[PDB]
Design a protein around this ligand. Structure first.
Ligand SMILES: NCc1cccc(NC(=O)c2ccc(F)cc2)c1
Length: 330
């Protein structure tokens, strides 16, 4: 089998991407944030504290003839960005772009943190990291990809995120029309439960490439590119007036600037992030200070190849016995 679904930016900045997911019988379609950095499929629901729902579409298990309470199971997740959610668990039929999994754990939120409530466009998350990170207790549950894997034509999914435009998540096949050149594959460590890999270096604009190993995760659920402070300083030093602002929470730059590109290495290959992808717009409405899309990972504890980086590539998440990642230009 295969599946193919379009993923759409939630706003004009590409702050996140939403993909429609069918849950239950008859189907209830929720728009979920596909997150290769976590491993829980959780949804706003009829059980979510009413004061914490503000415009989201909810899953109502009582209206699904295939929903079954997973008795005794609870979940609770705290994401690296400070957001969190928790609740109980149903199993139900879940379909993405025509690919169906029966008996998928659908984690129903009873509580969500304010950042989820405030984002009316995101009805939940669909985790695509390794199932070892799934938070369901006392019986850990599998991700949608892990449940589908054996049925897929090939044990892979691909992320093709757009810049200020829709893109695609494919399951079970590699669309050879979706990228240019060849796909360069690179090794993955699953020891922390992430799609963790090592970039071979970087360049800033037209500058020379610096060969240096940068360990980090391929995370479709993180908006920006978080890299070591040395790398980030070298980037922003090429932008007149850019500075790190403790009051804003990262690097800002004059909105009048034209940003340089940023290149990262995948083996001997190179992915180029155009400068425009690094502009996240005014820090507050009407400001002439703009927020940078490349930020320091100092204090996060891990480097994160988030959407800013991934949207510059066609990315293969290869879930073969030994997982690997593939990157192609597009
Ligand atoms: N998408 C799941 C996932 C996995 C690992 C790390 C994070 N994110 C962070 O740690 C983070 C912290 C501070 C920031 F400003 C931005 C991101 C998220």
């Amino acid at each position: 089998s295969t599946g193919s679904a379009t993923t759409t930016p939630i706003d004009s900045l590409d702050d996140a991407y939403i993909t429609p997911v069918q849950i239950g019988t008859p189907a209830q379609t929720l728009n979920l944030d596909f997150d290769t950095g976590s491993s829980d499929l959780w949804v706003f629901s009829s059980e979510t504290t009413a004061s914490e729902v503000d415009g989201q579409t909810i899953y109502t298990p009582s209206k699904s003839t295939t929903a079954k309470l997973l008795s005794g199971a609870t979940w609770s997740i705290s994401y690296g960005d400070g957001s969190s959610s928790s609740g109980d668990v149903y199993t139900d039929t879940v379909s993405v772009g025509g690919l169906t999994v029966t008996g998928q754990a659908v984690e129903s939120a009873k509580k969500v943190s304010s950042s989820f409530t405030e984002d009316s466009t995101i009805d939940g998350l669909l985790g695509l990291a390794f199932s070892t990170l799934n938070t369901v207790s006392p019986t850990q549950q599998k991700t949608f990809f892990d449940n589908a894997k054996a049925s897929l034509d090939s044990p892979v999914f691909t992320a093709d995120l757009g810049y200020h435009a829709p893109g695609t998540y494919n399951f079970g096949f590699i669309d050879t029309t979706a990228y240019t050149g060849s796909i360069t594959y690179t090794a993955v460590s699953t020891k922390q439960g992430f799609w963790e890999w090592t970039s071979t270096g970087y360049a800033v604009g037209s500058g020379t490439f610096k060969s240096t190993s940068i360990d980090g995760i391929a995370d479709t659920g993180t908006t920006l590119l978080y890299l070591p402070a040395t790398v980030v300083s070298a980037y922003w030093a090429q932008v007149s007036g850019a500075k790190s602002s403790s009051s804003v929470g990262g690097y800002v730059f004059p909105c009048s600037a034209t940003l340089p590109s940023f290149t990262f290495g995948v083996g001997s290959a190179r992915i180029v992030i155009p400068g425009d992808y690094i502009d996240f717009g005014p820090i507050s409405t009407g400001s002439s200070s703009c927020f940078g899309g490349i930020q320091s990972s100092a204090g996060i504890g891990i480097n994160i190849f988030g959407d800013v980086a991934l949207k510059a590539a066609f990315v293969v998440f290869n879930g073969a016995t030994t997982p690997t990642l593939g990157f192609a230009s597009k």
